[PDB]
């Protein structure tokens, strides 16, 4: 569950889970578009007397610093905000079934080309690399 | 094995005759743990085949390399080794309607090389799944 995992990230990164923060995350997880701060404000202000466009931007900054949101900029336009779903990279042993997680700094080139050729709007990716782990390789010479 | 069956299908589709010798070499490659030399293949099979020479082994490996079934691993002066190839796969997957669209990309060499270094794995092949929203779903969502 995406909201549950976002809240876990906040707790882990020491961010207070305020009602406004919860509501902004909920909005972001449920929205398909990349909203502006004004969009978020318009949607939520009716339930938060002390919410302002400033308060929305301030929270979005906290989220960006926690890795939950990316800020999209264009020309003279107000920023838009993309909720981030994690990518995953795994090495999988074909002999013993061992799975090892690793880190790689993104696959922008592939994602950009895939978006173009398939017409999809891209969220995130999972890469599985198959082969033989160090232990099995040693065993099999 | 499923791997062998798929290799035989490739041969059939590309017009390569499926001879006993070819079948035996493919079966050997599919079953091999390390990348064999031509000499390894020859010695493994020579008992079964009277007309087999080291030349016919190399000739068949060239045919398989051309068909995309085998890659040759070269080393300065030294005898080459041969790697049976498992295909990579690239898929775009729609989170809204479940649509999967296959696409082509020319390998992920930089990622594979780094992954082997950090994890210690010897790499065979990969499957990349990209998640998003398809064109059709985006149209309804208000793109
Ligand atoms: Zn293993
Ligand atoms: Zn769709």
Curated annotation (Swiss-Prot), chain B:
Transmembrane segments: none annotated. Possibly oxidized on a cysteine residue; the Cys-SOH formed in response to oxidative signaling may rapidly react with a Cys-SH to form a disulfide bond, leading to the loss of metal ion and inactivation of repressor function. Oxidized PerR can be further reduced by thiol reductants and repressor activity restored. Pfam families: FUR. Zn(2+) binds at residues 94, 97, 134, 137. The keyword Aminoacyl-tRNA synthetase does not apply. InterPro entries: FUR, Fur_C, WH-like_DNA-bd_sf, WH_DNA-bd_sf. GO terms for molecular function: DNA-binding transcription activator activity; DNA-binding transcription factor activity; DNA-binding transcription repressor activity; transcription cis-regulatory region binding; zinc ion binding. CDD domains: Fur_like (cd07153). Keywords: Cytoplasm, Disulfide bond, DNA-binding, Manganese, Metal-binding, Oxidation, Repressor, Transcription, Transcription regulation, Zinc. This is Peroxide operon regulator. It comes from Bacillus subtilis (strain 168). The gene is perR.
